[PDB]
Amino acid sequence: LPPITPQELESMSPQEQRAALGDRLFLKVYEIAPELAPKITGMFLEMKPKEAYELLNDQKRLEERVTEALCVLKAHQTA
Amino acid sequence: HLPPITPQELESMSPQEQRAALGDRLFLKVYEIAPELAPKITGMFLEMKPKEAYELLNDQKRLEERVTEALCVLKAHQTA
Numbered sequence A: 001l002p003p004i005t006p007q008e009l010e011s012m013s014p015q016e017q018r019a020a021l022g023d024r025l026f027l028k029v030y031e032i033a034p035e036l037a038p039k040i041t042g043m044f045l046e047m048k049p050k051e052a053y054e055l056l057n058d059q060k061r062l063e064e065r066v067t068e069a070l071c072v073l074k075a076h077q078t079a
Numbered sequence B: 001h002l003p004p005i006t007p008q009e010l011e012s013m014s015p016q017e018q019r020a021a022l023g024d025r026l027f028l029k030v031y032e033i034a035p036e037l038a039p040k041i042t043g044m045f046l047e048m049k050p051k052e053a054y055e056l057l058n059d060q061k062r063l064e065e066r067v068t069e070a071l072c073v074l075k076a077h078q079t080a
Helices: A006-011 A014-030 A037-044 A049-055 A059-075 B007-012 B015-031 B038-045 B050-058 B060-076
Strands: none
Touching: A006 A014, A006 A049, A014 A037, A014 A049, A014 A059, A037 A059, A049 A059, A059 B060, B007 B015, B007 B050, B015 B038, B015 B050, B015 B060, B038 B060, B050 B060
16 A cells, blocks of 8 residues: 555544554554554554554554564463 | 652642652652663653653553553564
């Protein structure tokens, strides 16, 4: 999917923002954690739209948020 | 442990005074959760808005959640 412009993000409803950001976040997370990509994307969609949008423009920040999300899920695993 | 900060004191303190007051009380609570990394975790909390750091002193569950989140941010910053 082509990137969302900053002008489109401010023009979308919260429902439209979630669908547009969620589809692009899922594809990028799928390249890092394919099995937990739907679960991690749902965690990302709880952030503010501006915060989730920065993940689509900074690869290094997206990797750290995925690593952070995996660590939080691992922390709750009473292994 | 220090006595809790009242909401009226927080609004009357300067930004530097808020850091000292919140930082001392946040450190004592985080120390009971992560004693070794408590100073670094407290510094991460002091970058939040004063109202948000104050809620961590009044909500135990959210405090534990933010510490776990802060610990996971530190793990993500590993060079190796």
